[PDB]
Amino acid sequence: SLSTEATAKIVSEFGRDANDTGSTEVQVALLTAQINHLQGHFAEHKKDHHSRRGLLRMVSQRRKLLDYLKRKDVARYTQLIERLGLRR
Amino acid sequence: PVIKVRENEPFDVALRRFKRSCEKAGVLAEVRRREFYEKPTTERKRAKASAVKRHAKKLARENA
Amino acid sequence: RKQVSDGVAHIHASFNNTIVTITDRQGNALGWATAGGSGFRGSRKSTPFAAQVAAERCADAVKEYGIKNLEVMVKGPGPGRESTIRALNAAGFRITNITDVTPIPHXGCRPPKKRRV
Amino acid sequence: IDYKDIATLKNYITESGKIVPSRITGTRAKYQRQLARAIKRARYLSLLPYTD
Amino acid sequence: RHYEIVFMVHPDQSEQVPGMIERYTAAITGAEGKIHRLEDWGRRQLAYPINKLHKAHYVLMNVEAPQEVIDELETTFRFNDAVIRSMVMRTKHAVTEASP
Amino acid sequence: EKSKSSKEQKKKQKVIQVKEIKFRPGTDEGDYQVKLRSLIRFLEEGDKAKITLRFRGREMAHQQIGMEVLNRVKDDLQELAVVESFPTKIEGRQMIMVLAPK
RNA sequence: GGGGUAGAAUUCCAGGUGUAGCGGUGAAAUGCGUAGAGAUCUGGAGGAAUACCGGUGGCGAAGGCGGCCCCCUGGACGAAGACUGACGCUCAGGUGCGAAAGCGUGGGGAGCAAACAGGAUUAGAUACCCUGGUAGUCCACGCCGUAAACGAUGUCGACUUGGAGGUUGUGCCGGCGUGGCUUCCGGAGCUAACGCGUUAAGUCGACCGCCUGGGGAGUACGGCCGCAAGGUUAAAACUCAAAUG
Ligand SMILES: NC(=O)OC[C@@H](O)C[C@H](NC(=O)[C@H]1NCCC[C@H]1O)C(=O)N[C@@H](Cc1c[nH]cn1)C(=O)N[C@H](C(=O)O)[C@H](O)c1c[nH]c(Cl)n1
Ligand SMILES: [K+]
Ligand SMILES: [K+]
Ligand SMILES: [K+]
Ligand SMILES: [K+]
Ligand SMILES: [K+]
Ligand SMILES: [K+]
Ligand SMILES: [Mg+2]
Ligand SMILES: [Mg+2]
Ligand SMILES: [Mg+2]
Ligand SMILES: [Mg+2]
Ligand SMILES: [Mg+2]
Ligand SMILES: [Mg+2]
Ligand SMILES: [Mg+2]
Ligand SMILES: [Mg+2]
Ligand SMILES: [Mg+2]
Ligand SMILES: [Mg+2]
Ligand SMILES: [Mg+2]
Ligand SMILES: [Mg+2]
Which of C's residues 11-70 have CB atoms within 7 A of nucleic strand G? 12, 14-17, 19, 21, 23-24, 26-32, 34-37, 41-43, 45-46, 61
Amino acid at the residue C53: V
Cα E99 to Cα E87: distance, rounded to the nearest angstrom: 16
Q: Which residues contact D3 (CB under 8 A, 6 or more apart)?
A: D9, D37, D38, D39, D41, D42, D45, D47
Mutate to test the interface with D, among E9, E48, E57 (most CBs of D within 10 A): E48
Distance (Å) from CA F5 to ligand 14 centroid? 27
Q: Which residues contact E49 (CB under 8 A, 6 or more apart)?
A: none
Cα E26 to Cα E29: distance, rounded to the nearest angstrom: 5
C103 CA, G29 C1': separation in Å?
Answer: 30
Report the alpha-carbon angle F64-F65-F68, nearest 5: 85
CB C112, CB B37: distance < 8 Å: yes
Domain locations along chain B: 1-56
Q: What is the DSSP string of A12-73?
A: HHHSSSSS---SHHHHHHHHHHHHHHHHHHHHH-TT-HHHHHHHHHHHHHHHHHHHHHHHH-
Which of A's residues 1-30 have CB atoms within 7 A of nucleic strand G? 1, 16, 19-24
Whether the beta carbon of B60 falls within 7 A of nucleic chain G: the reply is no
Of the candidates D21, D22, D18, D25, the residue with the CA atom closest to the CA atom of residue D52: D18
The sign one gets for the Cα dihedral A58, A60, A66, A71 is negative
CB F94, CB F52: distance < 8 Å: yes
Q: How close B39 gets to chain C, by Cα (Å)?
A: 10
DSSP state of B39: -
Query: CA separation (Å) from F33 to F23, F86, F95, F97?
Result: 11, 21, 20, 18
Of the candidates E65, A76, B38, the residue with the CA atom closest to the CA atom of residue C112: B38
Distance (Å) from CA B48 to ligand 17 centroid? 19
Cα E63 to Cα E34: distance, rounded to the nearest angstrom: 5
Phi, psi of E90 (to 5 degrees): -105, 125
DSSP state of E98: -
Domain locations along chain E: 1-91
Q: Which residues contact D41 (CB under 8 A, 6 or more apart)?
A: D3, E87, E89
C94-100 and C69-75 strand pairing:
parallel
Of the candidates E40, E35, E86, E30, the residue with the CA atom closest to the CA atom of residue E64: E35
DSSP state of C110: P
Cα F49 to Cα A55: distance, rounded to the nearest angstrom: 74
